[PDB]
Give the backbone structure.
Amino acid sequence: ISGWFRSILSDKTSRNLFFFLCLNLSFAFVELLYGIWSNCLGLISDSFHMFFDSTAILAGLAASVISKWRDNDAFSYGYVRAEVLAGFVNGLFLIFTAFFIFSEGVERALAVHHERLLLVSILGFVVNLIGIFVFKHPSRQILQGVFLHILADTLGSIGVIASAIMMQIADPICSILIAILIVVSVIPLLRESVGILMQRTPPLLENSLPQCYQRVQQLQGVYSLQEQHFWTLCSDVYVGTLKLIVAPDADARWILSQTHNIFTQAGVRQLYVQIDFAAM
Amino acid sequence: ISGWFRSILSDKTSRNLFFFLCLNLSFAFVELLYGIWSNCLGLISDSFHMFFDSTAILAGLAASVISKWRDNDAFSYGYVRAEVLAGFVNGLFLIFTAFFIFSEGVERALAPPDVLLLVSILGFVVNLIGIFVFKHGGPSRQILQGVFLHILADTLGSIGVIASAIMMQNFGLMIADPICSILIAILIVVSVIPLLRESVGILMQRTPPLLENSLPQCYQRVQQLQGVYSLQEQHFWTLCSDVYVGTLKLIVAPDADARWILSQTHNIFTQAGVRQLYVQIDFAAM
Amino acid sequence: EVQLQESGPGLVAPSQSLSITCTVSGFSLTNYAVHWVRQSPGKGLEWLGVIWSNGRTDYNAAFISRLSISKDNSKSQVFFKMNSLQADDTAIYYCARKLAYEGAMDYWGQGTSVTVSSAKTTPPSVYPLAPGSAAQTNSMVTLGCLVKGYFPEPVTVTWNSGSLSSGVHTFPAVLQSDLYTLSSSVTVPSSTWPSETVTCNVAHPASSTKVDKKIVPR
Amino acid sequence: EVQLQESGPGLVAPSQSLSITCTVSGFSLTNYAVHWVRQSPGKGLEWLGVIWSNGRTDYNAAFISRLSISKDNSKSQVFFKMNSLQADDTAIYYCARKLAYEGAMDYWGQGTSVTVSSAKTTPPSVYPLAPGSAAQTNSMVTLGCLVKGYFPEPVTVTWNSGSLSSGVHTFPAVLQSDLYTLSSSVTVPSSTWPSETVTCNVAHPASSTKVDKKIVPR
Amino acid sequence: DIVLTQSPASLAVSLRRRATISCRASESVDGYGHSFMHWYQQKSGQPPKLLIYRASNLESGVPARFSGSGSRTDFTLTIDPVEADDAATYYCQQSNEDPYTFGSGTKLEIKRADAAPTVSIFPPSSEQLTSGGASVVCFLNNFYPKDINVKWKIDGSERQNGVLNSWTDQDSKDSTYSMSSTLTLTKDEYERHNSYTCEATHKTSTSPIVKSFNR
Amino acid sequence: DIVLTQSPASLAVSLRRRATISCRASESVDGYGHSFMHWYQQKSGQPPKLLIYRASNLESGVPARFSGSGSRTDFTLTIDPVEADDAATYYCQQSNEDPYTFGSGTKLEIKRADAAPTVSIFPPSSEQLTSGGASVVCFLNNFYPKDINVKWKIDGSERQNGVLNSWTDQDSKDSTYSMSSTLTLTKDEYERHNSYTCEATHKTSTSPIVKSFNR
């Protein structure tokens, strides 16, 4: 408790991340309070969206600290996949609520102005501009999604600025607009996470695999290639398996070393080559 | 797309999901009509909650259809993981609605407003015929489990609404309304816990729980093979339900019978239930 | 040039221990496993065990409690030790180089005969066997060497120190009164006997007895 | 008993084709790869190619356009055909069995010498070689067989059909006037010559010439 | 363990014919298209020599007249053409399961034209005589078939008490057999009689062969 | 391709000593603890014979006096103790890359005590004179070293025009050499002189060896 209070003072980038998440959570609480006091659905939607952006950053940190952990009998590959899972979960929790936001919009669109202090929208604009300025420059699929979501938050704050200045009802249209923006923002992160979780061939490995297969086929005494499976374990960590059929007298040591060289040059960290001697 | 509909009706689970989705959408059109007759006050909210449900069954049906697609260059293992992903999404759906039901209780906990109960009854009957249809939820395991849990959550929600309403009019106990929602959100979270645990385990490349208890014996039997020196880098995971993938590297003697070692290791792990096994064999220096 | 040579005691008292040393040449124990297999008239060929180049050993499960195999790569030796030998362990024991990358044994040693009995080693009794007088001289003449009164098996019976090999017909041993007897028959042109010298060399490694009996006409 | 025997034309015209048939025995072509390797005094040992049991063929990349190796398992034959034969293609060609599960060549054929030239095959001229008169008889007396005017390699020169081999010194051929000279020397006891028959046997497979000439004193 | 049964127990095959030996395994010795069965040949007084490995692969250097075939539990070793040197015991060994087990063995006997036994006799030596015993040995060399009858005549008296018969394995060049029929007696038993005769009855001729000596 | 350089090109070792042959590879022929380098021996007029495979493994049947060592790019073949049969050319071959390449070769020369050449002379045969030529040949057998000088004297006249020298490889038993010095002439050139002499200058003795004949 007290150790974490003094630890972030020693470092600088972790202190900046702490300021990021703390301001996000504080302003999310503020927007939720004001949207409860008022009836600003756009403000409530931005609160929920950012609320979940801050949870995305926190879950990314938790996923990193869990992925640091060791492997064991149950988890032979380690807890690295949690990283991917975290991102995926974020997208799901970003697609559910936004869609539900859609609901409140169109519902209201069919069947409580309370201006009070509607000027907090420009404050949200300033905060989101600061956030995207700080984040303008294995943590690939943890913070890229967060960057996309804070860009969407800036656009949504612009939208709620428009809704507020129109209020002086254009609230349901901005609600469905931010819902569409959130969905289109979470499409690519969800696509990457789905690709990894579906045991798909790594996209950075796809175009170099026919060349690898041709080079492996050229090895002396190799007859055919079977059952080639390649997938992404986590960021830049690829797992590959293949079964070679070889001549009945083939040099299996040499073929194993050459196949491992061929696939190591292509970026496959873990490779499993099963060599089967043919009858003829 | 004309041949797609024939494929949907060919499969048992795909056709059941399609029929349930179509029945939900007909109930949907009837509901939305009664709403656009100016009675939309709570009706349109129910309508979009049920449209979210229809989205859940659509996700399950799409997963069932895609899982049977032939493997290709990009998807070496096929599309069977779309089953598991469905069980991950559906469970992750049911938690979210749970919280909202939780939140809904709060909406009637501080200042509950009193705002002809028939649509709940037809939704209930829909839910009973659905759980009758999907009794199998006790590769289509995660899809059926998630869809059955979704149907059970909706059935529970109908029970809660009906119970709250019958204490409203005929009994007049206003206190018992939020507690029903609190308890029933608790119940649906506990219902979806196991499916989420299994789906997270599968997607985290964890050792299969059914295979985990018989793996040391397999390692021991592989160790007893003549000319095997050691085992290392053994990795076993779940591709889809009941389909396990295993990889391992053996060090052997410099003159060991590699053919016999390979056949025996494959036999040992085939009796254990491993469907895809990759045994790399490395000859030692001495 | 791949050779395996077993050296071991021919006679082992029942319930003692038997130690055989297989010396190999033409190949190294750093990349070849060596099997131990015994053959008896009763049970036939029977696999006992194998030692691998890293020192890993595998045994027949029927011998796991009384068998041990060791080796030394520097002197290229493999040691076979058996405990509590009974009467059914009398057999020819062979050390065999396994065929590389296969489950068969491609090279074998000549084997050592191990007899498990409480009897003592008896030096052989060598007797010449010349034709009776000069009857039936012909062009082909037969001679014999009778090795009676040795224990245990085996003995090597040779004529003229291996210079003459054609016509040698050595007979297997017969056991009576705990004691072993055998005969060796040879044939030769009549122009060679008794023109030059023929001899029967009997070697009994169990008693280390060398006999160079001279065959003489009557 | 593992044996590879090559048969091919010793003399090949330039820019023509060379065809060698390697017959194997003691092993099957169904489980062994066969390499083709040529050796020349200029480029040393050069690997040409390999044929695998299923018929897969791998070639040296410098010969990918003019080389073809095939085989038939029934007669256990491997066929080696090279095109566009040039002046530096004259070499000894061997078919070698691959060492199983290794990159080496465990067994080799005796090889066939291939000479690429426009000159024609000339049968050898065999000349006796006896010491002048009876001077320096001593105990060791040297005889010789001279082979002049043959083309191309090789000739097998033997003494008494190879029955006597000790002291036999055959000298390598030497080129002059586009033709070849060779000498064979033998040392025999003085009491053995001219006591019994000593003969020089010259075999020239290029011209199919066979000579079993007697050596006589002057 | 896997039990290997070899049929027939013995096989008689003439020159330049085909010999077929079958090994039956209790369980399958197959794995992924490979049959872990091997064939050995053990000649007279020699260690087993590997002929076939993995049920179809000839060992480097063995003659091409040996061939192997089979899968699962049934395996066949075929010798064609059969030579005289192929007279030996042939064993099947599996290596699919621990422990390695061998077949019972099939003894291949070479069939040829019948030959009359060359019969010789040898009385006890003077050295053995002075030792205290007396052994008379009748030798029957180079005959066919294995079956032969030996009788001992002592001044017209038939004796089947102290006679020991020793057979030899079939020859690898001329495919014949040898018989050593020995009789043992003491001093007085040997010297109380004069004539000793060994009698050879063979299928080659109805008339038995007489080999006699006196004193 | 991978270029293998063998040093030294030639080596001279005495009996019962140690010989070391080194092979250098341009690129590494190692993969995962295995050095795909092999050693062959080629004697006089023989196909190459495998000695080492994978840089440290003795081929079955070759003598234990041969040994291999090394990794990556440096490899050593050691003969200890050196025998007389070890006189041959030794090659290193890599199989880590396509194509297979062999080393340039190192010729091992056996060192022993010097021996005086056994010198004989031979005039042209009658058949060769009737043919149209005349070849006079001096043989120098069983000597050491390779360096030997042969002179041709024709009635005291020195001739270096039509002389051909042929050397032999080192003997595998007695480790000596043989030299054939032949001279060719026509009929008139041979018959217009009388005496021919081959002169052998060797390092064994300062006095050269004379072998002469007349007519």
In short: The first strand of chain F starts at residue 4 and ends at 7. Helices of chain F lie at 126-131, 187-191.
